[PDB]
Design a protein around this ligand. Structure first.
Ligand SMILES: [Ca+2]
Ligand SMILES: [Cl-]
Ligand SMILES: [Cl-]
Length: 294
């Protein structure tokens, strides 16, 4: 079901001198759920229950997000993909995940998780993904109605929109969820970002890092690398397609549909589909994991 309660108890661990927050419930091989922008582990709260008793259920808050520490001093150069990766790699190392990990990824969680999986392929038992960056993007891949806004994030206007006005949290997030969110749900999403200014920097640095039309070149290269690898990897995959969907449609869906050893289902949703179809998503992931772990 739906519901505004978080899943499990927030745990904390020191990473590179900062505290990062995460959920870690149960025993066995991990099922590792990774949120993107502008969300947190909270995104998965109604999905993780479906995997109860199927393994160790983990959902990390990215640095600067959820209950994880902010990077100080924050600024325009902070919270790049590379910086996020340094923190997340270190947290995942610290968590002692073993060598049969199932990844469940969304949004920037997919860029991070696909890249981690490429680099740690022997440890990856399966990959479930949805509304993901399956390859480097072009503006044509980007949903038409949202192009101007994302272009504005990637311009000098971005600081006013995001740091001052919290547009990613307050506008984009509900705008890409089909059902109305409750007061408690929006409170949970806005909590890490209540303060104007640098507290909100992750939600601006992220759109500035999207690999689109060749920029930023480093993230483009990372996505090119994992795109080629995923299109050849025999690791089992679960693609949760969405209707109408948002990001993983058109050309980039055409591309991920070429990936080997992949099961697909379609659920209702736009981008943050976890808020629209958590039971269908959870049921599919649980079935995938049961097949991987007989
Ligand atoms: Ca909405
Ligand atoms: Cl084992
Ligand atoms: Cl973004």
């Amino acid at each position: 079901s739906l519901g505004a309660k978080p899943f499990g108890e927030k745990k904390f661990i020191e990473i590179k001198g900062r505290r990062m927050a995460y959920i870690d419930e149960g025993t066995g091989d991990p099922i590792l759920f990774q949120h993107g922008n502008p969300t947190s582990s909270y995104l998965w709260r109604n999905i993780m229950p479906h995997c109860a008793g199927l393994g160790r259920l983990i959902a990390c808050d990215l640095i600067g997000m959820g209950d994880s520490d902010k990077l100080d001093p924050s600024g325009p150069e902070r919270y790049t993909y590379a910086e996020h990766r340094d923190y997340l790699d270190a947290l995942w190392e610290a968590l002692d995940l073993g060598d049969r990990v199932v990844l469940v990824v969304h949004d920037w969680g997919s860029v991070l998780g696909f890249d981690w999986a490429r680099r740690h392929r022997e440890r990856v038992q399966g990959i479930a993904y949805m509304e993901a960056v399956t390859m480097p993007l072009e503006w044509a891949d980007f949903p038409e109605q949202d192009r101007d806004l994302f272009q504005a994030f990637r311009s000098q206007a971005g600081e006013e929109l995001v740091l001052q006005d919290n547009v990613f949290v307050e506008q984009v997030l509900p705008g890409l969820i089909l059902r109305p969110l409750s007061e408690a749900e929006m409170a949970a999403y806005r909590e890490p970002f209540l303060a104007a200014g640098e507290a909100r920097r992750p939600t601006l640095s992220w759109p500035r890092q999207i690999p689109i039309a060749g920029t930023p070149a480093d993230v483009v290269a990372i996505a090119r690398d994992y795109a080629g690898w995923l299109s050849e990897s025999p690791i089992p995959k679960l693609f949760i397609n969405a209707e109408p969907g948002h990001l993983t449609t058109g050309r980039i869906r055409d591309f991920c549909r070429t990936w080997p050893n992949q099961t697909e289902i379609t659920v209702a949703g736009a981008h943050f589909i976890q808020e629209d179809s958590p039971d269908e998503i959870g049921a599919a992931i649980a079935a995938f994991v049961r097949r991987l772990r007989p």
